[PDB]
Amino acid sequence: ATVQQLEGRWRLVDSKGFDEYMKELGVGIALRKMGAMAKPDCIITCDGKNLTIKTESTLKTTQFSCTLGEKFEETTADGRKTQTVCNFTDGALVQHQEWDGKESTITRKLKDGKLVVECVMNNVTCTRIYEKVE
Numbered sequence: 001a002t003v004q005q006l007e008g009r010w011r012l013v014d015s016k017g018f019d020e021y022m023k024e025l026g027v028g029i030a031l032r033k034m035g036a037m038a039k040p041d042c043i044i045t046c047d048g049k050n051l052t053i054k055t056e057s058t059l060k061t062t063q064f065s066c067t068l069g070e071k072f073e074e075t076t077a078d079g080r081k082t083q084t085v086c087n088f089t090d091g092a093l094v095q096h097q098e099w100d101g102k103e104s105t106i107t108r109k110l111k112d113g114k115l116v117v118e119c120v121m122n123n124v125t126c127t128r129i130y131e132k133v134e
């Protein structure tokens with residue numbers, strides 16, 4: 001498994017726990033309704049250790065870029081400014097966010113040809129499945 005195997009455009013096809021995760025993050029009702037009903041594509045590109053992830057939907061589009069292993073300021077979809085680091089470890093892309101004494105982890109992995117995205121904060125979890133799109 002390598003980080004390049006995650007590259008491409010991926011379309012959300014299933015979600016569990018996302019509203020509960022947004023509630024744990026402190027996200028207000030307007031953004032939570034958006035996130036409940038948006039059907040995003042995620043576009044992952046990686047050039048060596050340079051990673052970009054763009055999330056596109058009719059309701060909201062976000063994008064960040066980073067160098068694997070390097071701490072950077074990420075503005076999240078809900079507007080947090082976190083100290084984030086992304087690494088490819090044990091066959092998964094692991095994204096660690098820290099802000100205001102809080103922390104959340106997001107993992108992305110390839111399983112059966114689908115992109116499986118899992119998030120957690122304070123044991124509140126989400127699982128989102130994306131299928132590869134042309």
Ligand SMILES: Clc1ccc2nc(N3CCCCC3)c(-c3nnn[nH]3)c(-c3ccccc3)c2c1
Pocket residue numbers: 022027031032034035038039040042055056057060061062077078106117119128
């Ligand atoms: Cl308001 C809000 C708050 C938190 C969010 N966390 C997200 N992530 C979950 C998957 C791992 C990366 C983080 C995503 C998201 N990113 N890619 N897919 N969903 C969204 C989001 C963005 C645009 C359209 C629909 C949903 C989002 C929106």
